A paper describes a structure:
MTHFR catalyzes the physiologically irreversible reduction of 5,10-methylene-tetrahydrofolate (CH2-THF) to 5-methyl-tetrahydrofolate (CH3-THF), a reaction requiring FAD as a cofactor and NADPH as an electron donor. Eukaryotic MTHFR orthologs additionally possess a C-terminal regulatory domain that is connected to the catalytic domain by a linker sequence. The MTHFR catalytic domain adopts a TIM-barrel structure evolutionarily conserved across all kingdoms.
Consistent with their sequence conservation, the catalytic domains have highly superimposable folds (main chain RMSD: 1.85 Å), although distinct local differences are found in low homology loop regions and helices. Additionally, the first helix of the catalytic domain (α1) is observed in different orientations among these structures. In HsMTHFR (which contains, in its biological sequence but not present in the crystallized construct, the serine-rich phosphorylation region N-terminal to the catalytic domain), ScMET12 and T. thermophilus MTHFR, this helix α1 is projected towards the interface between catalytic and regulator domains. In our structures, the FAD ligand adopts a conformation poised to expose the si face of the isoalloxazine ring for the incoming NAPDH and CH2-THF. However, instead of trapping the electron donor or substrate (despite multiple attempts at co-crystallization), the binding site in ScMET121–301 and subunit A of HsMTHFR38–644 is blocked by a crystal packing interaction from a nearby symmetry mate, making π–π stacking interactions with the FAD ligand.
Residue numbers in the entry: -5 to 119, 125 to 159, 166 to 301
């Protein structure tokens, strides 16, 4: 009781007896779009998310919009907010300003990311090179005042695939002080489960690990998400969408809800409840996620 931190994603995760979700949002490009998203976020608090996240454009391209939205959400929603933060190709002063502003706004969680590969200005010659460089820097500068998350790849990272290679780098990130891990999206439950077994044996028996999940909002959008993330779609899932279903968008969406429910239930059962938190890539949409949560 004495040591519990009510704003820490790690402490909140372990304290839960029952399973739960988290939600990732992005900053809209207009003020009207931002007002509308805040209304949507307010409605989605009825799904009882453990925390919400706000994405960050590589190289600082959305710095002001991300910082503003994360702070506004933290102040008004009464839910912990985790701000994403990429480190390559950005001046140290921008990273320092972002962390200072988060700290002063009451934000106590950061998802520490590389972003794109490092690159300079050739002969005109950027001190962060990998995500681990940012994890170490945050912990040096703030200790446990920030609970720090990092990214993982059950099917391996691909530059714009070897999951064992990335497990080596993931271990370095955890040893440097990462407090939780969120995965790239996947549709093959067995790729996630083999990864989770390797994570427990080689990295940590207890660290919070969230599968990242992308709803199926149309047949074409589903295929596009898998293409961009380099995630495989198993034959057993593809067979649920024969041509007569593919042509019927309402049927695709309904079957898509069932596939996500089944994925979640299989993970919870097969891991004996070790995996009790499920992270959704919302793309600022509510309906599919509300059905997945209400029908489960
Ligand atoms: C949950 C989640 C949220 C995300 N949010 C965003 C976002 O808001 N904005 C955005 O731009 N991107 C985001 N990304 C994408 C991410 O920035 C890219 O996948 C990026 O290419 C790698 O980031 P990382 O932090 O996993 O990098 P790292 O863990 O640094 O690894 C990336 C690669 O760097 C190399 N590497 C790492 N460490 C070492 C080492 N010690 N020695 C040698 N080589 C090494 C490896 O080749 C490795 O595959 C997100 C990803 C996830 C899973």
């Amino acid at each position: 009781n004495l040591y519990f931190q009510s704003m820490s994603i790690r402490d909140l995760y372990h304290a839960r007896a029952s399973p739960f979700i988290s939600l990732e949002f992005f900053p809209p490009k207009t003020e009207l779009g931002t007002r509308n998203l805040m209304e949507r976020m307010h409605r989605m608090t009825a799904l009882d998310p453990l925390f919400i996240t706000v994405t960050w454009g590589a190289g600082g391209t959305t710095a002001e919009k991300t910082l503003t939205l994360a702070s506004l959400a933290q102040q008004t929603l009464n839910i912990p907010v985790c701000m994403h933060l990429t480190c390559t190709n950005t001046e140290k002063a921008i990273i320092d300003d972002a962390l200072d502003r988060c700290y002063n706004a009451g934000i106590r969680n950061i998802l520490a990311l590389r972003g794109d590969p490092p690159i300079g200005e050739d002969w005109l010659d950027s001190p962060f090179k990998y995500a681990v460089d940012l994890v170490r820097y945050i912990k040096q500068s703030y200790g446990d005042k920030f609970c720090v998350g990092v990214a993982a790849y059950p099917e391996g990272h691909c530059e714009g695939q070897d999951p064992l290679k990335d497990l080596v780098y993931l271990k370095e990130k955890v040893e440097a002080g990462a407090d939780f891990v969120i995965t790239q999206l996947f549709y093959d439950v067995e790729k996630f489960l083999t990864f989770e077994m390797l994570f427990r044996e080689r990295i940590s028996q207890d660290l919070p690990l969230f599968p990242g999940l992308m709803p199926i909002n149309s047949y074409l959008l589903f295929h596009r998400a898998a293409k961009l993330s380099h995630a495989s779609i198993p034959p057993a899932i593809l067979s649920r969408f024969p041509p007569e279903i593919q042509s019927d968008d309402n049927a695709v969406k309904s079957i898509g809800v069932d596939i996500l429910i089944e994925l979640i239930q299989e993970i919870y059962q097969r891991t004996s409840g070790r995996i009790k938190g499920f992270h959704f890539y919302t793309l600022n949409l509510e309906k599919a996620i509300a059905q997945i949560v209400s029908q489960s």
